[PDB]
Design an enzyme around this catalytic site. Structure first.
Site, PDB file in Angstrom:
ATOM      1  N   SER A   1      44.362  34.508  30.569  1.00  0.00           N
ATOM      2  CA  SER A   1      43.595  35.631  30.023  1.00  0.00           C
ATOM      3  C   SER A   1      44.480  36.869  29.903  1.00  0.00           C
ATOM      4  O   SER A   1      44.295  37.884  30.576  1.00  0.00           O
ATOM      5  CB  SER A   1      42.390  35.934  30.901  1.00  0.00           C
ATOM      6  OG  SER A   1      41.439  34.884  30.882  1.00  0.00           O
TER       7      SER A   1
ATOM      8  N   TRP B   1      35.468  35.201  27.630  1.00  0.00           N
ATOM      9  CA  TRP B   1      34.858  34.510  28.762  1.00  0.00           C
ATOM     10  C   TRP B   1      33.588  33.777  28.362  1.00  0.00           C
ATOM     11  O   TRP B   1      33.304  32.708  28.912  1.00  0.00           O
ATOM     12  CB  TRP B   1      34.645  35.462  29.947  1.00  0.00           C
ATOM     13  CG  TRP B   1      35.935  35.666  30.681  1.00  0.00           C
ATOM     14  CD1 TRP B   1      36.889  36.616  30.425  1.00  0.00           C
ATOM     15  CD2 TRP B   1      36.458  34.843  31.728  1.00  0.00           C
ATOM     16  NE1 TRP B   1      37.951  36.444  31.268  1.00  0.00           N
ATOM     17  CE2 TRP B   1      37.718  35.360  32.071  1.00  0.00           C
ATOM     18  CE3 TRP B   1      35.978  33.728  32.409  1.00  0.00           C
ATOM     19  CZ2 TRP B   1      38.509  34.796  33.081  1.00  0.00           C
ATOM     20  CZ3 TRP B   1      36.756  33.173  33.406  1.00  0.00           C
ATOM     21  CH2 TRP B   1      38.008  33.710  33.739  1.00  0.00           C
TER      22      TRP B   1
ATOM     23  N   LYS C   1      49.314  41.120  36.764  1.00  0.00           N
ATOM     24  CA  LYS C   1      47.946  41.307  36.296  1.00  0.00           C
ATOM     25  C   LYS C   1      47.119  40.027  36.370  1.00  0.00           C
ATOM     26  O   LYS C   1      45.993  40.041  36.873  1.00  0.00           O
ATOM     27  CB  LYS C   1      47.989  41.842  34.860  1.00  0.00           C
ATOM     28  CG  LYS C   1      46.632  42.218  34.305  1.00  0.00           C
ATOM     29  CD  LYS C   1      45.932  41.083  33.578  1.00  0.00           C
ATOM     30  CE  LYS C   1      44.617  41.552  32.960  1.00  0.00           C
ATOM     31  NZ  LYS C   1      44.853  42.550  31.881  1.00  0.00           N
TER      32      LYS C   1
ATOM     33  N   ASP D   1      48.018  47.203  33.758  1.00  0.00           N
ATOM     34  CA  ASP D   1      48.028  46.829  32.348  1.00  0.00           C
ATOM     35  C   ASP D   1      47.777  48.079  31.518  1.00  0.00           C
ATOM     36  O   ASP D   1      47.618  49.178  32.057  1.00  0.00           O
ATOM     37  CB  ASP D   1      46.996  45.744  32.042  1.00  0.00           C
ATOM     38  CG  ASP D   1      45.601  46.128  32.465  1.00  0.00           C
ATOM     39  OD1 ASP D   1      45.227  47.312  32.327  1.00  0.00           O
ATOM     40  OD2 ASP D   1      44.864  45.224  32.905  1.00  0.00           O
TER      41      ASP D   1
END
Ligand code: NA
Ligand code: NA
EC number: 3.2.2.-
Length: 242
Positions: A54, A65, A145, A177
DNA sequence: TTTTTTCT
DNA sequence: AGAAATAAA
């Protein structure tokens, strides 16, 4: 500044974060749907694998999602790697960097195979160890991340299938991020990890629970369903962050 | 340009 | 270390 943000976040509390997670957050909703259509161990393994791919999406997180959850409902999954080899190239919302992403799943497959129901329970009671172990399996920094985010999403999945709640560890920082860099720059010149870890410690709200609060509020999700006192505190946080 | 990662 | 991995305009 950090003191006011921390005061308001502390008033929202883990309770308020949990309210947003369980009632508003669309990734939690997608996970709840999938949890009814596949066995609980495969569910958790899929959630971690999905988290690890992701990044650099071709859609919004909530679209992605939901695509994942609707795709896997009712499916018979053996190899997570083989499942993703079919799923990603045909997806709408995760079409970039597919060979790299598939290779990450191949590399973590062995670790995922350790996730029996009991091992999931153990990791939910010790998410810091899960965090380090995912990173070690991938050969990467746990501060990255997608590793942080995989622990966050594991925590959603485990809460659902174990029907119990453990807060995220204070030591796991907010996923770093472009979007947290941008938000933080509006608020301060301090670097994001230091800033949000200070706020987390002062407020008593772990960073990953802060993460749950920030994005729906910044994205314009309605707070109207919160009871009056929580609603007021969420409104105050919106004034600071939006 | 904006919307993370490997390999080493 | 930092070039390269991909989709959209
Ligand atoms: Na690639
Ligand atoms: Na580690």
């Amino acid at each position: 500044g950090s003191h006011m943000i921390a005061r308001i976040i502390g008033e929202i509390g883990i309770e308020g974060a949990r309210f947003i997670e369980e009632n508003i957050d669309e990734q939690f909703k997608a996970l709840r749907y999938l949890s009814k259509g596949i066995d609980s161990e495969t569910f958790v393994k899929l959630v971690i694998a999905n988290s690890l791919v992701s990044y650099q999406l071709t859609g919004k997180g909530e679209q992605w999602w939901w695509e994942f959850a609707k795709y896997f409902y009712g499916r018979d999954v053996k190899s997570i790697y083989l499942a993703y080899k079919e799923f990603l190239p045909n997806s709408r919302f995760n079409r970039r960097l597919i060979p790299q992403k598939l290779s990450r799943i191949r590399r973590v497959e062995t670790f995922l195979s350790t996730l029996t129901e009991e091992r999931i329970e153990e990791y939910y009671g010790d998410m810091s160890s899960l965090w380090g172990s995912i990173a070690r399996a991938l050969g990467v920094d746990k501060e990255s991340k997608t590793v942080v985010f995989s622990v966050k999403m594991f925590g959603y999945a485990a809460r659902i299938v174990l029907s119990t709640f453990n807060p995220y560890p204070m030591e796991i920082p907010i996923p770093e991020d472009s979007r947290i860099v941008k938000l933080t720059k509006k608020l301060t010149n301090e670097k994001p990890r230091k800033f949000w870890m200070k706020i987390a410690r002062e407020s008593g709200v772990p960073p990953l629970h802060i993460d749950s609060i920030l994005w729906p509020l910044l994205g314009g999700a309605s707070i109207d369903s919160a009871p009056p006192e929580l609603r007021d505190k969420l409104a105050e946080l919106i004034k600071i962050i939006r």
